[PDB]
Write a protein that binds this ligand. Structure first.
Ligand code: FAD
Ligand code: VAL
Ligand code: 8GF
Ligand code: MG
Lengths: 197, 551
């Protein structure tokens, strides 16, 4: 039953242990779907969350192999337990709409019909471009507010939204804001902390 | 709160002090511009004997065999780039067979690291997978602690290799400032194991390399076998932990183990596994291994008792009903006082019966043709037993000859068995023997190598002659191959060739009688056969394949 698994590791904060831990999973032919690693309040210790797909049998012996590593102090397979799944995503979204957005898509591989589309900025006065950029901004803001997010940065052409929720909500929000034109995004990958519920 | 032991000392002076602090008396290595500040600080120091092999791979295998005889880490000192990458194979082998080993290798100056300079390689990254732990000393103030951690890691738990990457500018610097400064398993589980052992109807002891960790291991294994009247079998790396001339002793078990150990292990209702990872070449087919132990566990009357110090090797291949995490020699210390002697005549008789009904056998060279390989080993066993079995250390390559040495040579002495079993590196026999003869210069160090294995490291005979290291090479040849006599005498090994059973005792005696400070090769023209017993692919241990005259 190829299920998805989440490993939390307490690990030493020396160089190479990420390469050693990442490599230990690669030895077994494991693709790290997401990994998060940072310092603890203890400067010489780091906590990391590893997310991957595999059957529990192979994943358990992989987990027991990782924990054997010298810089590794503990690895917990939090998959079959009450954890709190969260993930932070940042996304820069264009306010110019799917008309103009194709120009950028075309020109980062490089147009006649697209620049003659009804709601392309070249065919519109400066205010309706201003009003539509703010209308698109208002839709993105209402959308990101509904998922529990925040509009962090705003510019003449785009805006940055910040959202932290379940990875399902994160994927849903990204797909839901896709038609505005995501210029670049950065999701943290799944992070987890066990719950007592 | 500051340590001044190293103030004013260069990197090499800090190094030799750190080597003395770890009772390091013998080192192996090869020079190079990236490690010269450390190389010149040890070669010229008289505290350490230095041995310069012809290849850095030999140095690693020489440190392996040195570490097997003298249960202490073998120190390796190679240069950066090509030198260090040559030790990758001996390093993975030490990790695969649990051999304590410490590799100090040079590196370009820290400002040139990453610039792909001359002889720069990601040694810390290449060794990372094949080493137990590694580090790159980035400042001279780190050097003493990183060395302490290197030896500590290499020798604790399951022993293994560590690599310390030493930049040239770090070890050539001077430290002008000070710096800041065997446990058993759970008592109740040990007790549970003893009570299970005492109530066992037919138990078996399964000894591995973990028993050889301390000299008190075999002493306590003999006590467990005597006080419990329990038969003993060993892995290929447990050879020597139990005296095989004991009538209680089943011999090696596994793919090519003894038919009686393969049979008795499958009938035993209790397994006493002592420092053994259950290799695929031990179990045959995992689900079919020890069915009587499996069934005795389902009824609560027995099962597998597992003593391991590494938590990843417990329940990793075989469900152990009573896991005893911790040192096995310390766990045994609290174990054998709880073992009550019980009548096990029938069980011993059953084993002893099969031991006499399915022995290692083979049709000898009927006419005057080439030697059967088993005949060469049997003649070595007879003459070594007469000369004094305790005076012998025996290493092997990797091949048929390796199994013949396990089958037809009787193993009595702890830490007298130096073979590559985990990684199976061919060419291991000759340098490991050179390393063995170094750790025990007074002992008969025999190398049982084959024509293909010997060919991978045979140039190290020049190292044996240069340092008066009298390794006695027993070469098995079958045939495309060179003249191994003229080959050996090219570099000082006064070798000779045998070719008949009627010729064998004289040649075997003259080869053992040769100068113990002078290498010699006994080439044997041998008719290579198959290895029996054998476990076919996907067959159980009791579906063994004895065949010559036992079908
Ligand atoms: C051609 C070939 C054929 C082979 N066929 C066979 C065969 O038929 N039968 C066979 O047995 N082997 C065979 N081998 C070797 C086999 O592959 C394994 O390497 C061998 O079984 C190792 O067994 P081991 O557990 O005793 O040694 P190791 O692999 O070294 O494991 C020893 C275990 O003891 C533990 N340990 C170490 N020190 C302590 C301590 N102080 N306290 C507690 N635990 C400790 C270690 O953690 C380790 O897990 C063969 C090898 C070759 C090259
Ligand atoms: C803890 C880990 C990420 C460490 N910082 C490394 O370099 O691998
Ligand atoms: C070293 C070595 N090479 C190839 C095969 C083998 N067994 N061992
Ligand atoms: Mg051969």
């Amino acid at each position: 039953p190829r299920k998805q698994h989440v490993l939390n590791c307490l690990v030493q904060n020396e160089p190479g242990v990420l390469s050693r831990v990442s490599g230990t999973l690669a030895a077994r032919g494991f693709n790290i779907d997401s990994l998060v690693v940072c310092n603890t309040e203890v400067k010489d210790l780091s906590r990391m969350t590893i997310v991957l797909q595999g059957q529990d049998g192979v994943i358990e012996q992989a987990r027991r192999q990782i924990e054997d590593l010298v810089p590794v102090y503990a690895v917990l397979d939090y998959t079959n337990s009450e954890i709190i799944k969260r993930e932070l995503v940042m996304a820069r979204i264009s306010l110019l709409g799917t008309e103009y957005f194709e120009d950028l898509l075309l020109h980062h591989h490089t147009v006649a019909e697209i620049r003659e589309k009804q709601f392309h900025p070249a065919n519109l006065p400066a205010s309706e471009v201003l009003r539509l950029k703010h209308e698109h901004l208002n839709d993105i803001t209402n959308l990101t507010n509904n998922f529990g997010g925040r509009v962090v940065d705003i510019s003449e052409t785009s805006c940055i939204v910040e959202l932290s929720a379940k990875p399902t909500r994160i994927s849903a929000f990204l797909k839901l804001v896709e038609p505005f034109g995501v210029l670049e995004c950065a999701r943290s990958g799944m992070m987890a902390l066990p719950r007592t519920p | 709160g500051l340590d001044y032991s190293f103030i004013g000392l260069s990197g090499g002076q800090i190094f030799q002090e750190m080597m003395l602090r770890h009772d390091v008396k013998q080192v192996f290595g090869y020079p190079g511009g990236a490690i010269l500040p450390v190389f010149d600080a040890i070669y010229n120091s008289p505290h350490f004997e230095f041995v310069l092999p012809r290849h850095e791979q030999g140095a690693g295998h020489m440190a392996e065999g040195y570490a097997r005889v003298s249960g202490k880490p073998g120190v390796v000192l190679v240069t950066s780039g090509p030198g260090a990458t040559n030790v990758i194979t001996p390093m993975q082998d030490a990790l695969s067979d649990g051999v304590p080993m410490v590799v100090f290798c040079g590196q370009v100056a820290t400002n040139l690291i990453g610039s792909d300079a001359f002889q720069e390689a990601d040694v810390v990254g290449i060794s990372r997978s094949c080493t137990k732990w590694n580090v790159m000393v980035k400042d001279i103030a780190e050097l003493p602690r990183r060395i302490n951690e290197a030896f500590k890691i290499a020798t604790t738990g399951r022993p293994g290799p560590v690599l310390v990457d030493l930049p040239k500018d770090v070890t050539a610097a001077i430290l002008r400032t000070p710096i800041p400064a065997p446990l058993p398993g759970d008592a109740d589980l040990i007790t549970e194991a003893a009570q299970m052992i005492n109530k066992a109807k037919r138990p078996i002891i399964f000894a591995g390399n973990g028993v050889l960790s301390s000299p008190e291991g075999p002493k306590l294994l003999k006590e467990l076998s005597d006080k419990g009247r329990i038969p003993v079998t060993t892995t290929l790396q447990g050879l020597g932990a139990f005296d095989e001339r004991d009538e209680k002793s089943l011999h090696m078990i596994g793919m090519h183990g003894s038919a009686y150990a393969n049979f008795a292990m499958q009938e035993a209702d209790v397994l006493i596994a002592l420092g053994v990872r259950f290799d695929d070449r031990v179990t045959g087919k995992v689900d079919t291994f020890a069915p009587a132990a499996k069934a005795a566990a389902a009824e609560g009357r027995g099962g597998i008792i597992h003593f391991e110090i590494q938590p990843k090797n417990i329940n990793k291949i075989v469900e152990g009903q009573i896991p005893v995490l911790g040192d096995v020699v310390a766990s045994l210390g609290e174990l054998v006082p709880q073992i009550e002697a019980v009548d096990r005549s029938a069980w011993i008789g059953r084993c002893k019966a099969t031991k006499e009904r399915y022995p290692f056998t083979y049709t000898p060279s009927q006419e005057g043709q080439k030697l059967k390989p088993q005949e060469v080993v049997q003649e070595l066993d007879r003459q070594a037993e007469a000369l004094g079995k305790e005076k012998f250390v025996i290493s092997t390559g990797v091949g048929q000859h390796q199994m013949w040495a396990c089958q037809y040579y009787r193993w009595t002495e702890p830490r007298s068995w130096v073979s590559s079993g985990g990684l199976g590196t061919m060419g291991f026999g000759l340098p490991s023997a050179i390393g063995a003869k170094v750790a025990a210069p007074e002992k008969y160090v025999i190398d049982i190598d084959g024509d293909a294995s010997f060919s991978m490291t045979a140039m190290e005979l020049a190292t044996a002659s240069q340092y008066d290291i009298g390794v006695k090479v027993l070469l098995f040849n079958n045939e495309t191959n060179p003249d191994f006599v003229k080959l050996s005498e090219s570099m000082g090994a006064k070798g000779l060739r045998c070719t008949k059973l009627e010729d064998l005792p004289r040649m075997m005696k003259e080869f053992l009688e040769y100068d113990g400070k002078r290498p010699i090769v006994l080439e044997c023209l041998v008719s290579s056969e198959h290895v029996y017993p054998m476990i076919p692919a996907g067959k159980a241990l009791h579906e063994q394949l004895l065949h010559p005259l036992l079908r």
